[model samples]
Target: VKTEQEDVLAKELEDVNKWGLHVFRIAELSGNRPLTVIMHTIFQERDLLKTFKIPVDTLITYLMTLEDHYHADVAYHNNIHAADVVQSTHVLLSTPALEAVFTDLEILAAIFASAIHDVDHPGVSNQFLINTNSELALMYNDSSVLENHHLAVGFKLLQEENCDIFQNLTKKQRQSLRKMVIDIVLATDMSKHMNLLADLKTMVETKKVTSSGVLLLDNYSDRIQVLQNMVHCADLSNPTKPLQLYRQWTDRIMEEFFRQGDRERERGMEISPMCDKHNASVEKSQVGFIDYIVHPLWETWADLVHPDAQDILDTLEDNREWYQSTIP
Candidate 1:
């Protein structure tokens, strides 16, 4: 008989492209092994381990440790969120326009970076860390504070004997992977938002494709820039998901923001935008976030991939309307 876990994984795998894969349900079904299961499944599906000579045992061990690195107490930046991002990254990379653009190495880095991007997140914004003079902010000198720490802790965990999945790679390959991973993860900082979006807009406006319809990114700078925007698009992809899932993310982020508001109030600091529970309306906030940040980013992304993400864009507009209806 097929086990319950097998059944759930099978269903999820079948529906991975619909943007409706319930990663939270997967977390529950897998006993909080969502990240491990998702990443391992993607790696296996892509034949990455065999193609790259990565040992299965070592890969599993490393993924388990990486999953453990995420703090469950965080409202929105926990393992479940990481797993969702990884699945989203997988979906974006599998887009028909993007299918032939990236190498196996770049795809591997994208998935891995998404998995670990918010590892060990402190459940507060970077501004909070800097204002509170938290050690993490101080350590990174207020420069993409949490992102810097995440990169450090994530790579540090890989140093263990049982977790060194990259042991099979040549030094040059390892170096290249490290550089790509760091660049991708660091780009997740919202501080880089405008510049990243600008570069993406420029690329889409002048998109170069081969006769076969594959994107023609001829150099590392051009390729990594697109991958960076791809990861960013996936990170802020909550509103583009199904209504239920999008609401779930909104609730979780609001809870996190309210918690930060509480901290700010307790410390006598001014509450950040959308953090004040007493004044903020979730529906209105969602509408504004969708208009200002989410839609623009995804709109540009849809233009980049051209027709591949139309359904996702449609869902985003529907989500915006849903929130708008709830305003009054």
Candidate 2:
């Protein structure tokens, strides 16, 4: 029961998949100039160099090298979702009301945070990490263990000479980017979901940013909070993508989650939400994930992206109805 738009988005994925960009090409749909899409695509992977001086071609190759890392076989975290998050990060960064408030440092941080936000993600939730006493949690001493690990791996990948895209930043720029990246990455931990959203709401209210305008990231906390929610929103962007795109993510993430459940069962552990191999109901779990988690997040974010996100919400509701129809 795929819609025409889903079919088109699927076809577009061939290119998005090829480019390892993880994001659907909204270039044609958003009415943004073709070059703007290309530039934004380039910006997602190698944009850090605009201020840092990394060779463009080298950075491009480095990003291409990252596609394989994001594509998932058994993990809930995968490249498609990564691209979705990254692109969402870009859209969130471009809200009309918050036009000129940020500096290049914040922009670079947002882009970098988006690109490497989920590197080597294992597809399990943070609760699983805590519940199963997984090595990731143990290795990092429990607090935001997976997030810290994700950030570490992202930076580790950059250690390669070709990938040190930020090698040339001035001390000031490098410091700011590092701080922002840290804040954004740490915020992705679902454990921080409540506090992060509360902070974001407060910032929106206090800043009086009803319409699009420049971001005012004056100090470390401001800069960090902006990027923090940027990745958080991206991580939770399922309901804001085209229906087909969102469905694909639902499938992959559930598969990965189920795979983790299978592994846990093997070790005599309890299964978590969406992970029970025996009792799992694709339609039901998806409905719950959307109703409880996905929709609320997207509703807030769609407000940020406005009209561009409307179609995504429509697709989500339509998809939900499609799932509802499946029940007896």
Candidate 3:
């Protein structure tokens, strides 16, 4: 018989198969160990463990280390966000329009990329790090500083002997996975948002498809392009989730932004948009976020994937209207 705690956890995770999985509940249930549990269950449930020959202990080692590096003190961009992105990535990959269009390697890379996409995030934007002359900015020369660090830290963890989850793969497989993961994660930079969305819009318009509308991306460039947008969408999925979940994300992200604003004020730098806690209008910011960024990207994505993301769009619209109603 399972323990009482296990019963509670099992109940919470019963909806893990749903697109709107409650990772925040898992965060509480697992005691800040959400990343480890969610990633582990996802891999095992999807047969990634046996199929990829991933030793469970090694996977645990990597996940725990990665989660620990996620800066628990930060309001957002922590392990919970990482787990949420992985969940969204998995759901997007499961979209029926793209069924069988991706290989097991692509699926693995998509999930893995989302898992470590923000592994060591410090809960600040690249612009903040750059303007402040931060060492991370200097180290990476201000070029996707956070993404580079996340990738570096994530890969470095794998170098710790048994922490290598991809250890069983061949050299070529390993290399391709690294490239795909890198490409997918780096594109998650908001600096690349419009560009990525533009490419996605172009891809959606000219995409080749099967007789049944199955995505027919054949080449590496095409495949990686789609995967890049997948992670990008997943990373920005906060506004598209259920309202209660969306509210939590909005508050957490605004808190993070306000922290940056606090620092900027301390440094005598101009507070970035929507960063000032006192002056910024949370409702208006979210409305603009949805109007300018989130909605466009999701609409493009839904256009490409179709059917699967329809309900998600409905939720987004409802959230948009709710936030829009809150302003002034």
Candidate 4:
């Protein structure tokens, strides 16, 4: 990579190499194309573009196309969320104990998986799609419905000539990449959340690191297990961010939940829990999710990554209590 052409995003992405990258500001500054410039810089920073022989224009084209497909209408699950997850995934992979623990191929797959994890989210839950008998539920047979669709569509988009970001990879390389991509994306389904955490919990106990604190995930199953949680933790990272960013994420997600409740009420279906905006305690929802869903996984996640993520757990605890006492 040369000194690089003059670009505003490169200037904006000054701290892009670190944890706690503010994706919300990047979203506004990049004009809804956050993933485009963010992923490009991430790839360039890793020399992944050069390592994998991905042509510059093709990578740019692919990133822009994927960003475009992320359904800007959805409040929480849009491209900005994707950008957040991507940067978070990068941060998790960079955790000190796990440093160089994954191959560049695994690193690339983790990045790609996060970028596409929730692409084309319909602003509705898997239950909504299943209840409505939507094609997505039918096509995926209700198993990891949204996750399945994201993976299917995510890979399909890359098949186009101009968007073939993996064009130069060997067939064997492509196969391994595809396998890890599927496993990583499928693990993002919340239905798999408990099973994922349990497996990680057990693995962390069974596979002890060196006294030097080098993590020893000795095999493929163990390695992919760590990678699986890498994206999952990223997917759950909103509560662990700085307060203003955390607040913005809370508002957006609640809005999406409220919209779903609106649809359910109109359709004469019982509104899903937390989806009922009129009856809901917005602040209470944060406390409950932080207590039950977020905190448990984050606590276990902190154990797996140890010191690297303890700060995140502390943030989650604070976010939980702040939301608890702030209920109106």
lDDT of each: 0.88, 0.64, 0.88, 0.86
The count of residue-pair clashes in candidate 4 stands at 0
Report the lDDT of model 3 for residue 67. Answer: 88
- Please give the lDDT score at residue 269 for candidate 2: 82
Q: Where does candidate 4 clash, by residue pair?
A: none
- Clashing pairs in model 1? none
Question: Which tens-of-lDDT digit does each residue in 96-127 have in candidate 2?
Answer: 54566677777778877777777777777777
Q: How close is candidate 4 to the true structure, as a TM-score?
A: 0.96
Query: How close is every model to the real structure, measured as TM-score?
Result: 0.96, 0.79, 0.96, 0.96
Q: Model 4: how far is 80 from its true place, Å?
A: 0.4
lDDT (Cα) of model 4: 0.86
lDDT of each residue in 282-320, candidate 4, tens digit only: 888788888888888888878877777888888888878
By summed lDDT, the worst window of 10 consecutive residues in model 2 runs over: 1-10
Encode model 3's per-residue lDDT on 197-250: one tens digit a residue.
998999999987788878888799999999999899989999999899999999
TM-score of candidate 1 to 2 decimals: 0.96
Candidate 3: regions farther than 4 A off: 1-7
Residue range with the least summed lDDT across 10 consecutive positions in model 1: 1-10
- Those runs of model 4 whose alpha carbons end farther than 4 Å from true positions after fitting are 1-8
